[PDB]
Scaffold this active site. Structure first.
Site, PDB file in Angstrom:
ATOM      1  N   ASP A 386       0.833  -1.191   0.000  1.00 18.14           N
ATOM      2  CA  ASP A 386       0.000   0.000   0.000  1.00 18.14           C
ATOM      3  C   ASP A 386       0.870   1.244   0.000  1.00 18.14           C
ATOM      4  OD1 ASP A 386      -2.337  -1.596   2.286  1.00 18.14           O
ATOM      5  OD2 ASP A 386      -2.501  -1.407   0.095  1.00 18.14           O
ATOM      6  N   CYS A 420      -2.843   0.780 -13.674  1.00 17.48           N
ATOM      7  CA  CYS A 420      -2.907   0.980 -12.235  1.00 17.48           C
ATOM      8  C   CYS A 420      -3.906   2.105 -12.062  1.00 17.48           C
ATOM      9  CB  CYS A 420      -1.537   1.395 -11.663  1.00 17.48           C
ATOM     10  SG  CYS A 420      -0.856   3.018 -12.163  1.00 17.48           S
TER      11      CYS A 420
END
Length: 489
Positions: A386, A420
């Site tokens: 993350d 992404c």
């Protein structure tokens, strides 16, 4: 260059500059010292100065009280003109009128600072071509500088005198910064009495290395990476191409972020409307399409593109809901299931779970025509953290090797689709790594690679590819890992 950008300055100094040599409407941008990776927009208004935080989330630039952007340059361009709408939370307008240029030449490609003329001559000799040049400090006459130029080949040294804050080569016009001087003489080349033209075509390359000695260079940068990356950023003003199609009213909702748009001259134009936030990336024979993660209203467009471009491999770099954030609408069917998405039909034939990724074998076709059916392999990378980057690049390297073979085994396949969140950060990191490894994979370790030049090339095809220093370093790490776990063979 990003003249309005000041690399080694503090908040306090920045005020002093704008309060002394700036007027109302004057602005500059600086790296934030309080925050690693973040930046600040110091603007002068009403005889006083505000400092607006620009954060780098790791995926893009987030302007407090403003929008999100792929580059600082695109940020300034956006407020410096069309849609000059920068406001405080009160709702009052902050205007960016006059860029306050920086005299400090440090992150310029041609500037080498403390350096000897014997050292400089070495570099120019074996790293240079006609037109290669650099600017070092004079060991001999302190405060002055030397311009060294390469042109059956010779190197020529010209004194640059620093007199009362201005710079000159011994005659003519006296400049305010070394950058002024250099731009002038790039445009207006000095000539010899004997008729030689001192052309300044391109700064001397200090970033190209031989793949073999990758470990030694990584050693140096780890001692840096920061300098190299910043110098790369200072080139983004050379990349301000048109993104007019993405700004069309009809196309606005087709973008995840309103001001992160595809360059017109590389966008994917959908035939049979025509818009999608995606760009074709061609290295300068595998090519790529870089695109944002899907929006619920763009899924049909995604598959139209895949069908149209003849893509047979998809690379999804974001994992299934990382934590409390939509980074891509699910655009593929459950395993064994079969779904339609407008005129396109997709069956999920099978899913294999690896440790770092999931593979889905998908069958794609246009409705009505069975003969148009082709297998598309979706490679879903799952273990990207993350925050930051993977500690080890092995999982990424292994992932790309598999993508590469899949691509190579499918005859006359179109571009590999990589995506992404916004389609610029991880998308950029995977693509560059893959281009670098491709070069090594084909030409061996006795080959020249230049990470920053490779990122620049790619950035001329989609805005702001590769977002962070961590990603920059990781690209280096990835290539070093590949080289090492290859030489041992």
């Amino acid at each position: 260059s990003r003249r309005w950008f000041h690399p080694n300055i503090t908040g306090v100094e920045a005020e002093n500059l704008l309060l002394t040599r700036g007027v109302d409407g004057s602005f500059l941008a600086r790296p934030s010292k309080s925050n690693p990776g973040d930046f600040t927009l110091s603007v002068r208004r009403n005889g006083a100065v505000t400092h607006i935080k620009i954060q780098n989330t790791g995926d893009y630039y987030d302007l407090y009280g403003g929008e999100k952007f792929a580059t600082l340059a695109e940020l300034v361009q956006y407020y410096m003109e069309h849609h000059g709408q920068l406001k405080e939370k009160n709702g009052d307008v902050i205007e960016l009128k006059y860029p306050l240029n920086c005299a400090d030449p440090t992150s310029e490609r041609w500037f080498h600072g403390h350096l000897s003329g014997k050292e400089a001559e070495k570099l120019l000799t074996e790293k240079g071509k006609h037109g290669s040049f650099l600017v070092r400090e004079s060991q001999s006459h302190p405060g002055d500088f030397v311009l060294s130029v390469r042109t059956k080949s010779k190197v020529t040294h010209v004194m640059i005198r620093c007199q009362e804050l201005k710079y000159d080569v011994g005659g003519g016009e006296r400049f305010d910064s070394l950058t002024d001087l250099v731009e002038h003489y790039k445009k207006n080349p000095m000539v010899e009495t004997l008729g030689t033209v001192l052309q300044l075509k391109q700064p001397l390359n200090t970033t190209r290395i031989n793949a073999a000695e990758i470990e030694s260079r990584v050693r140096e940068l780890s001692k840096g990476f920061w300098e190299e990356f910043e110098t790369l950023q200072q080139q983004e003003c050379k990349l301000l191409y048109s993104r007019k199609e993405g700004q069309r009213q009809e196309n606005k909702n087709k973008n995840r972020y309103k001001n992160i748009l595809p360059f017109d001259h590389t966008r994917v134009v959908l035939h049979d409307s025509d818009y999608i936030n995606a760009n074709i990336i061609m290295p300068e024979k595998k090519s790529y399409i870089a695109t944002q993660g899907c929006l619920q209203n763009t899924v049909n467009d995604f598959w139209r593109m895949v069908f149209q471009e003849n893509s047979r491999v998809i690379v999804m770099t974001t994992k299934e809901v990382e934590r409390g954030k939509s980074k891509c609408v699910k655009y593929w069917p459950d395993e064994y299931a079969l779904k339609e998405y407008g005129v396109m039909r997709v069956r999920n034939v099978k899913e294999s779970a690896a440790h770092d990724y999931t593979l889905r074998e998908l069958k794609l076709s246009k409705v009505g025509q069975g003969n148009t059916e082709r297998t598309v392999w979706q490679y879903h990378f799952r273990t990207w953290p993350d925050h930051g980057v993977p500690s080890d690049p092995g999982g990424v390297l292994d992932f790309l090797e598999e993508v590469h073979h899949k691509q190579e085994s499918i005859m006359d396949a179109g571009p590999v689709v990589v995506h992404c969140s916004a389609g610029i950060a991880r998308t950029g990191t995977f693509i560059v790594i893959d281009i670098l490894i491709d070069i090594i994979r084909e030409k061996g370790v006795d080959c020249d690679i230049d990470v920053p030049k490779t990122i620049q090339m790619v950035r001329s095809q989609r805005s702001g590819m590769v977002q962070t220093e961590a990603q920059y370093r990781f690209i280096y790490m990835a290539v070093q890992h590949y080289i090492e776990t290859l030489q041992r063979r």
